[PDB]
């Protein structure tokens, strides 16, 4: 019985026929070969196909175990610590650039206003080349989404207002090739507080709603309203152990005097997804060292 699956990358869509004994790895490997991606360890096959949960597919398990064409999103799952130092291929860099830009523009990654303008200008340099008073004049940037909706909502400028501010930065990017404009975009984005972080809805022992963030450097607890500023930070080197059992997850600090952090997930599968990102990020962190 053939199963229809769609995989989308940030600038491609692929439709596949797979059998019930096709592995996640066979799907992943044919995606990466089609697009010519070598730096595979950053990436994964995403799917909101739990009974409602955002998840990452397992490569050494048959696709035919967890399911909501079957829809998959080929996306970066782990983020480098330093984008300029670590991303080797232009394709890898482009795929991060597009994924990160979508997170910013969709309001998912908070962005200050002047940063949004500057980022938008690099995106403009990447999509349009050098600004030319001849080629790009009045309204060259209408029809273009360049600033997050929450930035515009909180501010008092019109669309032409915004294009104008972006246009004055575009011109300073004369001589910048596209690939380099995409990296400069990432150099700025990777300084944003929400960049590169996987957020999970958790509760402490008192029943307060919190966020857990897992990122390349460790674990963070946020109050429900402040996803930018970690309330509690757990860098890998400050963790004695991490554990879960069903819905209960515990972080034990290296400081024998300091107390455990205990929180609760809504289901077992959430805690499993948290720990796999924990393991994946810790291992990449150790591999860099």
């Amino acid at each position: 019985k053939p199963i229809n699956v769609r995989v989308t990358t940030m600038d491609a869509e692929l439709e596949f026929a797979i059998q019930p004994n096709t592995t996640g790895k066979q799907l992943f490997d044919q995606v990466v070969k089609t697009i010519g991606l070598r730096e595979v360890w950053y990436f994964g096959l995403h799917y909101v196909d739990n009974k409602g949960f955002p998840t990452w597919l397992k490569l050494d398990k048959k696709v035919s175990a967890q399911e909501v064409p079957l829809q998959f999103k080929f996306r970066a799952k782990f983020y480098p610590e330093d984008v300029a130092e670590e991303l080797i291929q232009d394709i890898t860099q482009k795929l991060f650039f597009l994924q990160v830009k979508e997170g910013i523009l969709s309001d998912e990654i908070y962005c200050p206003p002047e940063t949004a303008v500057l980022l938008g200008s690099y995106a403009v340099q990447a999509k349009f080349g050098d600004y030319n008073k001849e080629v790009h004049k009045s309204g060259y940037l209408s029809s273009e989404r360049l600033i997050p909706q929450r930035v515009m909502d909180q501010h008092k400028l019109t669309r032409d207002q915004w294009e104008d501010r972006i246009q004055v930065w575009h011109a300073e990017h004369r001589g910048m090739l596209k690939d380099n404009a995409m990296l400069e975009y990432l150099k700025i984005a990777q300084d944003l507080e929400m960049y590169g972080i996987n957020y999970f809805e958790i509760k402490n022992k008192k029943g307060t709603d919190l966020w857990l963030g897992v990122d390349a450097l460790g674990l963070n607890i946020y109050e429900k309203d402040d996803k930018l500023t970690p309330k509690i930070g757990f860098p890998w080197s400050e963790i004695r152990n991490i554990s879960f059992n069903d819905k209960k997850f515990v972080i034990k600090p290296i400081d024998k005097k300091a107390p455990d952090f205990v929180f609760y997930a809504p289901r077992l599968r959430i805690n499993k997804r948290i720990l796999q990102l924990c393991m994946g990020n810790h291992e990449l962190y150790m591999r860099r060292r």
Binding site: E13, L14, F16, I18, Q19, T22, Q26
Partner: peptide, 14 residues
């Protein structure tokens, strides 16, 4: 035998 079979592709340039 279990290897996926590509039936469709869309590539966005811009």
């Amino acid at each position: 035998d279990s290897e996926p079979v590509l039936k469709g592709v869309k590539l966005h340039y811009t």
